[PDB]
């Protein structure tokens with residue numbers, strides 16, 4: 001229905017605004033672009049599904065997310081990719097891991113404060129009907 005297409009349009013507006021707020025935070029610069037294949041040729045042998053905030057915006061605009069739960073699966077993949085590639089005790093790996101945990105926690109805290117639970121449940125029930 002047109003009412004259902006208006007629901008998904010409001011979801012995309014909400015997701016673009018959360019993603020912009022994460023992308024402008026200086027802590028999260030390292031997550032705003034893909035890990036570059038030239039500079040790190042090893043990366044794509046270890047990490048089988050790369051993800052970053054530029055790819056997330058492109059996915060919003062391609063209508064890949066019908067719920068906030070499917071958006072948070074990609075924010076969780078950004079964070080778990082960084083924990084698995086950079087697991088060592090040295091300061092450069094510990095700094096990346098602390099930033100990855102902060103990007104995940106910050107996304108979940110904005111959603112807990114600003115997403116209406118009945119709006120999410122509506123998106124879930126339209127998705128489950130299709």
Ligand SMILES: O=C(C1CCC1)N1C[C@@H]2C[C@H]3C[C@@H](O)[C@@H](O)[C@]2(C1)O3
Nearest residue numbers: 030031035036039040082085086096
């Ligand atoms: O995992 C990441 C991203 C950082 C947030 C996630 N990288 C892997 C490389 C290791 C480290 C040092 C450079 O080699 C640079 O390319 C990366 C980027 O930083």
